[PDB]
């Protein structure tokens, strides 16, 4: 790490600076940020103040990347959002009056909602006691649950897809499947709940 302990993470949100007069405690926070003369790290290349970005997209885009092809990973994430948009637009056209104002045509809304349904609620961690390993359920933290949902999405669409079907279209199908709570990822989430509920009497082993 070329940054010393004094350097801190920069603040990028423009709206945080343009309307500071409506609050007092937050004003004391950033006025002392430079009054303490604390050094600020350089702005990361990925994050930007553009209003069209989203933090959950960047993390998902990074995991899709293999090697160092950020261009290819960004290209795949662009097509997948387009592919989802095309399918929802077509379904909207062929619908009745009541069905028309039900379909969502916002890929970002679909993407955010899809991952919030693939996150497990309670995980498992092996614990060694008496020379044997017992799968003990634990209340997984929010960051772990969010990361675990993304990994399951990538793992499924990389392994059990056909060789002919492209990556952007295969991932688009699973997002719609997870949006309706019927995708194989949702099945895997329930399977982890099945094992956690089966070993509900082993929760006493953990010591935290």
């Amino acid at each position: 790490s070329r940054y010393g302990p004094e350097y801190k993470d920069p603040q990028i949100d423009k709206e945080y600076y343009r309307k500071p007069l409506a609050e007092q405690t937050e004003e004391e926070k950033y006025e002392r940020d430079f009054k303490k003369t604390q050094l600020i790290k350089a702005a990361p290349a990925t994050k930007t103040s553009s209003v069209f970005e989203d933090p959950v997209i960047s993390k998902f885009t990074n995991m899709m990347m293999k090697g160092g092809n950020k261009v290819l990973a960004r290209s795949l994430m662009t097509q997948t959002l387009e592919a989802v948009k095309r399918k929802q637009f077509a379904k909207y056209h062929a619908a009745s009056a009541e069905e028309q104002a039900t379909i969502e045509r916002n890929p970002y809304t679909i993407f955010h909602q899809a991952l919030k349904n693939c996150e497990p609620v309670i995980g498992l961690v092996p614990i060694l006691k008496g020379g044997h390993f017992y799968q003990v359920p634990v209340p997984l933290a929010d960051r772990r649950r969010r990361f675990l949902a993304m990994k399951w999405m990538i793992a499924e669409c990389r392994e059990k897809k056909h060789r002919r079907v492209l990556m952007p279209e295969k991932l688009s199908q699973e997002l719609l499947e997870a949006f309706h709570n019927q995708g194989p990822v949702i099945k895997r989430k329930h399977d982890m709940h099945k094992m956690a509920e089966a070993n509900r009497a082993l929760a006493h082993y953990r010591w935290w």
């Binding site: 069209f52 662009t78 387009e82 045509r105 970002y108």
Partner: protein, 136 residues
């Protein structure tokens, strides 16, 4: 469309894996006779492109280098109409057109700030604008 391909070199090879001249192909040779100005009662609209070109650099777009010495030689005279990017009036019309079809589905895409970002990123170019609007 892609008149520069009627004179440039051809990737296709033969049984000896040796490149063939563009005049070997019958389709190009006969179509070549359809652009030499000798007949009456007709008009031909041409377009020199780069996306499908062979052995041409990405940056080159002017008619002379795309056609080369031979291509430009057998095309004079002509009227080199130049296609430009969007003007500020056109840019607003294209953006408003998508908003009428509910294409730009981002929450903040309806504001002027989103319009400024689209103008800067796309450089008011129709080709880049379509790619951006397809996923935002």
């Amino acid at each position: 469309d892609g008149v520069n391909a009627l004179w440039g070199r051809t990737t296709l090879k033969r049984e000896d894996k040796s490149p063939i001249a563009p005049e070997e192909l019958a389709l190009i040779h006969n179509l070549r006779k359809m652009v030499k100005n000798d007949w009456q009662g007709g008009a031909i609209v041409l377009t020199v492109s780069q996306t499908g070109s062979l052995f041409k650099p990405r940056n080159a777009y002017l008619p002379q280098e795309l056609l080369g010495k031979e291509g430009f030689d057998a095309l004079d005279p002509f009227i080199p109409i130049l296609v430009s990017n969007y003007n500020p009036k056109e840019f607003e019309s294209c953006i408003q057109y998508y908003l009428e079809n509910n294409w730009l589905q981002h929450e903040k895409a309806h504001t002027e700030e989103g319009k400024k970002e689209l103008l800067f990123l796309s450089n008011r170019n129709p080709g880049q604008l379509e790619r951006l609007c397809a996923y935002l």
